[PDB]
Amino acid sequence: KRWIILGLNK
Amino acid sequence: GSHSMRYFHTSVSRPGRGEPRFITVGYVDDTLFVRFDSDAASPREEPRAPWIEQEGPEYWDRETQICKAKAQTDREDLRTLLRYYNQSEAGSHTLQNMYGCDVGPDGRLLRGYHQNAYDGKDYIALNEDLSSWTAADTAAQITQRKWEAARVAEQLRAYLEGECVEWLRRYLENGKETLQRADPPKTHVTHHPISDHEATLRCWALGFYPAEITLTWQRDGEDQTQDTELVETRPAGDRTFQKWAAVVVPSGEEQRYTCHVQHEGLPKPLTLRWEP
Amino acid sequence: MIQRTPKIQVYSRHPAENGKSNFLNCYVSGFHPSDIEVDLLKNGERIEKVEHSDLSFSKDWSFYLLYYTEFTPTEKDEYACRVNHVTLSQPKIVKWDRDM
Structure with a gap:
């Protein structure tokens, strides 16, 4: 199952 | 013995030929189990192993949603890195990302991973402590600053020690016929x-x-x-x-x-x- | 920009047995960037209907892909893999050797 942190930009 | 789960992501810009292509695949050990390609007819994450097919519509919708979000953030990041490296918008560039966990025979987290590369070179990576970062250059240092200020590491660590190991263990049991043979x-x-x-x-x-x-x-x-x-x-x-x-x-x-x-x-x- | 030319291997899934159905494989790896052209050839002509794995990469970030097609080897028919890549000044052709 994947992970995700909304708006994570470099 | 020990097992691993990994998600691989690649975004490649192609100026003059539409938006960047995005491809991501998931593996448990050396078995491919899910894939997503932004160039497919109706982009959706698809199963590539039998033991994952049993997952429900909710599973697939969330996965597909995550894949699309990642695809979008990569497009934004590709534009951002052009600035960081004072590069022209004329060339094709690549952004790669891999993350996942390793668990021992007892199902305990052995090590977590999260690393990115730009144009094939190390960019930024989460250290084995799952709390600090290693930036390859001054450009990557800028990203480090944003991620520390946003507490990215804390959240990543939470996923790696929790959901990552849990679902890997779940997959290992459902596909034991093959994953444990x-x-x-x-x-x-x-x-x-x-x-x-x-x-x-x-x-x-x-x-x-x-x-x-x-x-x-x-x-x-x-x-x-x-x-x-x-x-x-x-x-x-x-x-x-x-x-x-x-x-x-x-x-x-x-x-x-x-x-x-x-x-x-x-x-x-x-x-x-x-x-x- | 760093560029890594692709390593190429052409082989069959199962040991070659004339008249027996099999799969011809062309495995390209260790390359960067990802843009690559791979053709499976039968007696010099490009084979149609050739599938490929989804783009993935190794620990050193270099890419790898598997191109394959079903085929029934014979003693006459020659098979090969033709690869095009920015690192290559010309299409590289690797012949199938039912011993490698």
């Missing part, structure tokens, strides 16, 4: 004369799983590390792998050569010789 290699040695002065001895390993394997030739019990031709382990296409190692031996001295095979599927390391 090691197929030992079928092995043999071939002999091909090169000239009157020498011949080629090739040690083969076929149909094995997982990919990890050690193939080595010995001359009078001495490793031919320097004199051995070893090809990259390759996929047969049916989940198994293949590999071979070869040496050029003076004709007539074939018996002084022994091939040694190490694979977790083998109770004991193997020793093969050319039997003329």
Whole structure:
């Protein structure tokens, strides 16, 4: 199952 | 023994030819189980292993949603990095990302991962402590600043120690028939004369799983590390792998050569010789 | 920009047995960037209907892909893999050797 942190930009 | 789960992501810009292409795949050990390609007809994450098909519509919708979000953030990041590196918008660039966890025989987290690369070079990576970062350059340092200020590490660590290990364990149980079965290699040695002065001895390993394997030739019990031709382990296409190692031996001295095979599927390391 | 030319291996899924159905594989790896052209050839002519794995990469970030097609080997028919890549000044062609 994947992970995700909304708006994570470099 | 130990197992791993990994998600791989690649975004490649193509100026003048539409938006960046995005491809991501998920693996448990060496078994591909999910894929997503932004260029597919109706982009959706698809199963690639039987044991994952049982997951419900909710699972697939969330996964598809995550894939699309990642695809979007990569597009934004590609534009951002052009600035960081003072680069023109005319060339094609690549952003790669991999993350996941390793668990021991007991199902305990052994190590977590999260690393990114830009144009094939290390960019930024989460350290094994799952709390600090290693930036490859001043540009990457800028990203580090944003991620620390946003507490990205804390959240990543939470996922890696929780959901990552939990679902990997869940997948290992549902696909135990295959994920927990090691197929030992079928092995043999071939002999091909090169000239009157020498011949080629090739040690083969076929149909094995997982990919990890050690193939080595010995001359009078001495490793031919320097004199051995070893090809990259390759996929047969049916989940198994293949590999071979070869040496050029003076004709007539074939018996002084022994091939040694190490694979977790083998109770004991193997020793093969050319039997003329 | 770093560029890594692709390693190429052309082989069959199962040991070659004339008249027996099998799969011809062309495995390209260790390359960067990802843009690559791979053709499976039968007696010099490009084979149609050739599938490929989804783009993935190794620990060193280099890419790898598997191109494959079903085929029934014979003694006459020659098979090969033709690869195009920015690192290559011309299409590289690797012949199938039912012993490698």
